[PDB]
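Subject: mismatched residue count in predicted assembly?

I count 469 residues in my input, but I want to confirm that the predicted structure covers every chain. Input:
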Amino acid sequence: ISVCDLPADRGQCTAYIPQWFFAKTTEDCEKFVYGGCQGNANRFETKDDCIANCGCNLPSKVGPCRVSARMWFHNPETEKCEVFIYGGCHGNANRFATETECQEVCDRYQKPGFCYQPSETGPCKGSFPRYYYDYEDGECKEFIYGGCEGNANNFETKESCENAC
Amino acid sequence: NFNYGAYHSLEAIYHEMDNIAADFPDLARRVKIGHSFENRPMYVLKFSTGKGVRRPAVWLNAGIHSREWISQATAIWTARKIVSDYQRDPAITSILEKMDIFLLPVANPDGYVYTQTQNRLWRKTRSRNPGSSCIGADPNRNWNASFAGKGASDNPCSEVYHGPHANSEVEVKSVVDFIQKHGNFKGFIDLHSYSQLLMYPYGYSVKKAPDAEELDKVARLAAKALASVSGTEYQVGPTCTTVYPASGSSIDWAYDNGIKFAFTFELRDTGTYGFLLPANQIIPTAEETWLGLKTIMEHVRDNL
Ligand SMILES: [Zn+2]
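Triage response: the counts match. Full output below for your records.
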């Protein structure tokens, strides 16, 4: 499924649940109301989750206005967060106030596949403080490794973990 | 001892495909149909009882979009399912006797390795195209079916970039050339994720397909058989109205090339996990999908 190409879909139900979707018209992540049932994949709990899915391949967009400011966007051509000038309105989803925000949001689902597997302690009874990337928390978290077997989501330090993941 | 309830490297999958063909040399053959942009082999499992002449066959396609891991995992369980139930299940056993099953578990090997090692959500091929520093084209917008019409982008940085021209992606050309050379395919089923949809032509236009009636009937029968395992619910319809316009899609190319039974499955789930479907759901997904697959295949067996 290409999530970002689906329309908003409130569904057929009567619930009232505010969510985000990627709007193809404006190419920005926007709020809509979800009816709790049916609908489709283009539906996110937060704005950042929506951008992490749909925003990071868009070109930079200055827009019409000229209340200008320096912003950051993930450049798809270099896969680097770079500065651009935002006119102040009508921009797209690829727009962040800081370099770090741009990096953390756009890299959310773009880490190596092994970063997304559950931390595996292994069978053995050792206790080695190892770190792993936990995508739910979006953080490299300490855990305790048995000492043999396990998986690649297993790092000796935190900065080691966040370097890989 | 291949854990079918785990996600695997391309290496492991290719190897398990080899073991399957080793254990059933009578029934299964690993055939190389081409290579990827980065020169990896494209392997299919051919299932047959027809001693090497061209029979009618159905194409089972998976992993064209690399991040859609449940797709490849389902496809390789299905390889094992087909051999393990030959002459133990009247259903496949009866299909196999009439026709050949071609199974491509990883239609986009380069992208798959890239998801495992670099970028979990990668969708496209890894072709490097003059004109841009952006990499890859969407192999499911690359086929010769209203190529470059509405439902695909010409921005190389787009997830749905159609590419420079129809069949530009060697992964896609490989399948096209092989199906056309054969020339008597009857079914073409493309596995994707996620959303739980089972769709049929057309995606490139609102126009009803000449077989739209029967397609919906089968789809719905297949949908019901699938639901009858664990209660998993699918919606059914033509692509363009069910999800969005999509030009140059595989099932459209197929249908316009005289393969009548052309369907897409968007497997589990509906959004709780999305592309990151936990490993503990691979088998449940594969079991239920199997029934929908057989239902379609039975139906193809009978229209022959
Ligand atoms: Zn797909």
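Chain A has three domains: 1-54, 55-110, 111-165. Marking this ticket as 'not a bug'.
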